[PDB]
Amino acid sequence: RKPIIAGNWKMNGTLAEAVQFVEDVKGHVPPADEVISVVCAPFLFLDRLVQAADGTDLKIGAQTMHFADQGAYTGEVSPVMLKDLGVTYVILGHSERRQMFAETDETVNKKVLAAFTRGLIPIICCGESLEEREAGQTNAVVASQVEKALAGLTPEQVKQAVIAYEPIWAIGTGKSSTPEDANSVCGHIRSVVSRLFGPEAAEAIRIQYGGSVKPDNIRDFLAQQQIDGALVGGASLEPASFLQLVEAGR
Amino acid sequence: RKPIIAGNWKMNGTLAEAVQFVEDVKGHVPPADEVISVVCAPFLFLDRLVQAADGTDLKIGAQTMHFADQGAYTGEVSPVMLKDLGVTYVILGHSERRQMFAETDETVNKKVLAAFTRGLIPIICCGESLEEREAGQTNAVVASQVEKALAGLTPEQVKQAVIAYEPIWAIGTGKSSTPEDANSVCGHIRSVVSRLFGPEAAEAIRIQYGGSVKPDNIRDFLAQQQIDGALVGGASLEPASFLQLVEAGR
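Structure tokens for the assembled complex are given below, as produced in the milestone run.
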């Protein structure tokens, strides 16, 4: 399984800074065949970012999108628009959207289907909250989210899907899950995939860990058998930091 | 009161079409001192649109934004990013956001304030549901949204704000309100603005009607004394149609 390290800038940056970032990084990123290097920037910057990253291994992703191809959805961006722009990845179901913008498992599922329909690789986010974790419902919660998100896909598509396990309590908190625990949950996710789509799909689908991943600990996560990469927020904002992250995928 | 016609493309178009649209229209839009012509396009296209429309009377707007300048809001675009790009207008609280993406009066207000503190002219949407309408709560519902949305502003900035009354039941349904009725609702709104910010602000603030506005009925709405423009959806997608709408502003 080829590792995939994705940077989620969230709502940060200015066009100029976004371009400089890609500019300083696009050339020193590992070769595509060794690591999937992704930067998910704000909608406003995608156009120039795709332009700047053209002819390099740096891949550009969106932090979200709608499920419909077009329609009366003021403010939403469609997968058609993203594909057309040259965006290749899209983050779906990030806890931030599930918590504040009414993103549900149902809409995540619709978007996941829409992603594969429009040629975008989906990075599906799942994760338990502190309360769920403390109630020992982690596996059930994560299983349920993964099941509903992948519902309707063929095993061939699941192979290309990317699932990002991100315990909500670990996002931007400075408290990350231990590699062992994260590996266990990711192993459970892979197992859930295996029971839904077969061992072949589960052996190919890449599962990332996300939540306070830093260039000083990505290796610990990446080293785990069930963890194929990292979804990185805070530590993906600086070019130097980002480079260290993707570098660990080699 | 200078009329203002804003086109809300919603989630439609591709970058190329959007650029062609601006190119075909930018130089044939009425003089800015006569009518404010605005195009609110998907986040993805703003950059190129702003560059293309630069130096013309065609203004570019966003369909929404978050209220924070930056932060952990995956998928959101901040007012800072928009201003920086050169975007002048932003639609806020569109009924589509309110019913589908957890947009509340509280968040709209936060955005209205963010817009003003960031140099963006907000087009604040309000409107009643078919139910609320059938239950004679139209004036109440609309007055409530307008009060909460504007709460915190000074009379000086309220003068520069734009309110867009849009009967939810009239949006994209082909069933638009009657000019008389819309004039009543808008009249009520203006009164509310007066009772809260004084008459000087109530007479300057521009109130648009929105919902199934077409080139063949826009004049009937602009004719009304309380209606200073229109927020147009479907009829704003075609360049030729958009030009007719804005021409009615003269």
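Residues 179-197 of chain B form the longest helix (19 residues). The domain at 1-250 of chain B is CATH 3.20.20.70 (TIM Barrel). Further analysis is deferred to the final report.
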